[PDB]
Amino acid sequence: APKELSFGARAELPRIHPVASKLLRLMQKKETNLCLSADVSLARELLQLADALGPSICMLKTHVDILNDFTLDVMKELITLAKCHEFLIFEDRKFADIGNTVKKQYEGGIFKIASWADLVNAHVVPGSGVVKGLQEVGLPLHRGCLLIAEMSSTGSLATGDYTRAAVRMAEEHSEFVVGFISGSRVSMKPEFLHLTPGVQLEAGGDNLGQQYNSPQEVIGKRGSDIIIVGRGIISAADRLEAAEMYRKAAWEAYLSRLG
Amino acid sequence: APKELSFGARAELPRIHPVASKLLRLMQKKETNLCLSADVSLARELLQLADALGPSICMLKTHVDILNDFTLDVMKELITLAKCHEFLIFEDRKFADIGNTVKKQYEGGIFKIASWADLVNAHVVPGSGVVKGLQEVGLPLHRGCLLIAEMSSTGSLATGDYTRAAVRMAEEHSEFVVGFISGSRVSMKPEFLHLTPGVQLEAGGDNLGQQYNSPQEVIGKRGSDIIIVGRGIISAADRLEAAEMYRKAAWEAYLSRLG
Ligand code: NA
Ligand code: NA
């Protein structure tokens, strides 16, 4: 493997996407490679978490279709927090339809996801039309996309040639695609981010197929860039001290890998 | 292949799911195996289409995340039409996350999909946790699910062993899973429905990877049960006469296959 570059140096790579470079520079400024999976159903709790944990995170990942009281003004308030504390907003929509449909789902409907999400993600199962359709909205809005190359869950079919196809599709749509959701490093090109869910400090899983690995395993041994942490933080009593524990774990694993 | 049973006889199979049997009986009563893909962004147009075309269709497929003016009362009015004209409502949500997440996306948020959708669909890429999570909402609500075994779009990765995995997952979750979105017959078990999108009378595609086959190819040669038709109907001037053309095509292909 080529010699590892710092996040700050990766932010300067000739082929880097502007959204990736903004992310990489705030990761190095803030010493955080933690993405908070803000898995709550109340706008107040989402906003209180974003404000308190904002300084500790590089990214806040939302499922806005689980917010009981979603409005676009909630997302305006989230953007204010994102700008104040310096983190990106990633809507974990997992687009997975034909290109003509995802185009509408990204721009339109109640959620107007493209209006407030810096990043979205997509499954590669439909073929590259899924990326084509999203990019016809996302490119004019200066957004980025992550392709789901592997999943954390038991029985995942995102393996082998499927994973290779995701990497190829990302390479070929680099104007819009900034990286992967994956369990490890899947691309050797340093311009691409790797974000990894299924992360907790302790061993375990849930009863619906989620499986966990630690920040040291995921960042240090498996070579990913960012950990996505949900229940490990959200279910804790003190979510701020939980986020700090995850931040320091992921940051030190990165530093020790960087040498 | 075993001798083909009529829709009415399939509705009586020992292992048939109640939602599948309701569907099969209305298909045979109404002489329709057409599912309308109601791909519009206005509630008024969705409701006017559902009323006018209701008699011609067995199912109305929605993308409620593309409706600019979604409210739950729109879905109440759609249910009234579904009951009046006898068709099922299928929300084409393509759930594709870990089980713990899809559970919430199905029951909760603004859309409360499980409250009004007879059928939903899911990708199998996350492993069977996706089905497990949906069924914890769907079983108590007496709903059914379709697993996406193949896709119509260029570059689709839902082929080979992926398709085989979808069929296995459906078999093993038959209390909830009633069939497939697929391009052909993928299961030899007659209790399972096969629904096929990417359908028009004329050859062609779109520029975002959609590819078309005719009702005679899909139902007659490829052995699917139901055609899903969107732009072939929606973009026509007279949507009612378009739906009738598709209905008669799909019904006759079925009858000629039945012998
Ligand atoms: Na995930
Ligand atoms: Na489809």
Side-chain angles (χ1 to χ4, degrees), chain A residues 92 94 151-152 181 197, chain B residues 97-98:
Chain A
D92 186 2
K94 298 193 169 52
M151 293 195 63
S152 58
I181 301 303
Chain B
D97 214 307
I98 67 172

Side-chain angles (χ1 to χ4, degrees), chain A residues 157, chain B residues 90 94-96 119-132 134-135 144-151 158 162-174 176-184 186 192-197:
Chain A
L157 308 174
Chain B
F90 164 21
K94 298 193 169 52
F95 291 102
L119 294 170
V120 292
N121 58 349
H123 280 297
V124 298
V125 66
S128 60
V130 71
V131 179
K132 300 203 187 301
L134 292 174
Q135 75 178 17
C145 189
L146 295 166
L147 299 186
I148 295 160
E150 299 177 325
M151 293 195 63
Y162 185 104
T163 301
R164 290 187 276 274
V167 169
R168 196 151 42 244
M169 197 176 291
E171 281 166 4
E172 295 180 354
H173 294 85
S174 66
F176 183 52
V177 175
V178 300
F180 302 98
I181 301 303
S182 59
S184 303
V186 289
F192 293 96
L193 274 294
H194 294 90
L195 283 72
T196 298

Side-chain angles (χ1 to χ4, degrees), chain A residues 61 63 92 94 121 148 150-153 181 197-198 210 228, chain B residues 96-98 101:
Chain A
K61 183 181 76 67
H63 284 292
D92 186 2
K94 298 193 169 52
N121 58 349
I148 295 160
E150 299 177 325
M151 293 195 63
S152 58
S153 41
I181 301 303
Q210 177 64 301
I228 297 175
Chain B
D97 214 307
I98 67 172
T101 293

Side-chain angles (χ1 to χ4, degrees), chain A residues 8 135 176:
Chain A
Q135 75 178 17
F176 183 52

